[PDB]
Amino acid sequence: QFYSVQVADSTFTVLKRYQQLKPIGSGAQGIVCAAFDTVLGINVAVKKLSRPFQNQTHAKRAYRELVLLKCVNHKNIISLLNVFTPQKTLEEFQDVYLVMELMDANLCQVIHMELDHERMSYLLYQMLCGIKHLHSAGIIHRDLKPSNIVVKSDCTLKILDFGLARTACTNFMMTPYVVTRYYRAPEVILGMGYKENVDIWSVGCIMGELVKGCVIFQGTDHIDQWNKVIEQLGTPSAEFMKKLQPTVRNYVENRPKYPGIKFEELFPDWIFPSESERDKIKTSQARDLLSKMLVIDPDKRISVDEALRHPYITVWYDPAEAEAPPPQIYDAQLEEREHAIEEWKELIYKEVMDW
Ligand SMILES: *[C@H](CC(=O)Nc1ccc(C(=O)N2CC[C@H](Nc3nccc(-c4c(-c5ccccc5)nn5ccccc45)n3)C2)cc1)CN(C)C
């Protein structure tokens, strides 16, 4: 297993099977290169994490995502072809390389391509399949947005990361690009506490964006985000508001009361194909599902299991993908403990050596 070094902005030491390294982006966790794997005969993406153990946030993210790849195994979630380090001992250990099949684009790039119903409904289906698989493994993503999701030109899709640990003191973030509130569920903006269907809200916002071509709830701060939500969906019920913490409830109950816009005006026929018997049906189904995902009160928001059975999605439904439990449930207790930087180094190195 001899290595080759190639400077690509920084410097990439990789097994020689990986040829033609080309930069294609920069992740929160490090530099991504495209490459060709001459052993497998396929294009791959190669990501280098430099000293993931140096920073605590980077350590918990590197460690939990290494472990989670042993818990999940699903076509719509990142799975790794290879994990390696070029350093030969624990204490010269610095760099972890992750290898997966090369994806063509991120979802943030497909937003402006005005997809038809067949492609929109297939992307939605795959998102729901991956999320159901993540939930079954004990993972609520909590930070799904267009940039967390990559696609190939054949419209296949993978959720790229495992989201936000509950014990993340970093609120709701990590940065390839500009941190935004656009996809965060209202219960999260309001400080309420969250359940799994926070991920359904995010998927609704993404689906709305690919229908409309623009961001559905484009708040410019925490306060403006809530306003953009109630302006379009209506002020939620008194029960929901009463359950807020008094200071939040005081502010929220004092806003202008909005009635909400019917989804037939929010998502009218003219932003959909809608131009045939078949497309009028699909448009009605798409809008009905949107009206069940984009629901402020999480107790009335559709679940992933329910969304997966929706008529808009049936053309794609395949139990081999939609009813596919994960190899293991994640044991989070080990990620929540303190761990010094040198403990993280050992923990990460061990996982790297398990490959
Ligand atoms: C707007 C979007 C924008 O302006 N620019 C932009 C957005 C996304 C991308 C991108 O994500 N791409 C293009 C090719 C890349 N292919 C690919 N394939 C597989 C994996 C990755 C990848 C990995 C990774 C993980 C594990 C092993 C190997 C690789 N990690 N990351 C992190 C970030 C991005 C990709 C990636 N990539 C996908 C390019 C340009 C958004 N704005 C509105 C917020």
Swiss-Prot record:
The modification Phosphothreonine is found at residue 175. A motif (TXY) lies at residues 175-177. GO terms for molecular function: ATP binding; JUN kinase activity; protein serine kinase activity; protein serine/threonine kinase activity; protein serine/threonine/tyrosine kinase activity. The modification Phosphotyrosine is found at residue 177. Keywords: ATP-binding, Biological rhythms, Cytoplasm, Kinase, Nucleotide-binding, Nucleus, Phosphoprotein, Serine/threonine-protein kinase, Transferase. It catalyses: L-seryl-[protein] + ATP = O-phospho-L-seryl-[protein] + ADP + H(+); L-threonyl-[protein] + ATP = O-phospho-L-threonyl-[protein] + ADP + H(+). Its main location: cytoplasm. GO terms for biological process: apoptotic signaling pathway; cellular response to reactive oxygen species; cellular senescence; Fc-epsilon receptor signaling pathway; inflammatory response to wounding; JNK cascade; modulation of chemical synaptic transmission; positive regulation of apoptotic signaling pathway. ATP binds at residues 24-32, 47. It is found in: Cytoplasm; Nucleus. Dually phosphorylated on Thr-175 and Tyr-177 by MAP2K7 and MAP2K4, which activates the enzyme. Autophosphorylated in vitro. Its EC number is 2.7.11.24. Its cofactor is Mg(2+). GO terms for cellular component: cytoplasm; cytosol; mitochondrion; nuclear speck; nucleoplasm; nucleus; plasma membrane; Schaffer collateral - CA1 synapse. Residues 18-313 form the Protein kinase domain. It is an enzyme of class 2 (transferase). The active site is at 143 (proton acceptor). Activated by threonine and tyrosine phosphorylation by either of two dual specificity kinases, MAP2K4 and MAP2K7. Inhibited by dual specificity phosphatases, such as DUSP1. Serine/threonine-protein kinase involved in various processes such as cell proliferation, differentiation, migration, transformation and programmed cell death. Extracellular stimuli such as pro-inflammatory cytokines or physical stress stimulate the stress-activated protein kinase/c-Jun N-terminal kinase (SAP/JNK) signaling pathway. In this cascade, two dual specificity kinases MAP2K4/MKK4 and MAP2K7/MKK7 phosphorylate and activate MAPK9/JNK2. The TXY motif contains the threonine and tyrosine residues whose phosphorylation activates the MAP kinases. Belongs to the protein kinase superfamily. CMGC Ser/Thr protein kinase family. MAP kinase subfamily. Interacts with MECOM. Interacts with DCLK2. Binds to at least four scaffolding proteins, MAPK8IP1/JIP-1, MAPK8IP2/JIP-2, MAPK8IP3/JIP-3/JSAP1 and SPAG9/MAPK8IP4/JIP-4. These proteins also bind other components of the JNK signaling pathway. Interacts with NFATC4. Interacts with ATF7; the interaction does not phosphorylate ATF7 but acts as a docking site for ATF7-associated partners such as JUN. Interacts with BCL10. Interacts with CTNNB1 and GSK3B. Interacts with MAPKBP1. Interacts with POU5F1; phosphorylates POU5F1 at 'Ser-355'. This is Mitogen-activated protein kinase 9. The lineage of its organism: Eukaryota, Metazoa, Chordata, Craniata, Vertebrata. The chain holds residues 9 to 363 of 424 of the full protein.
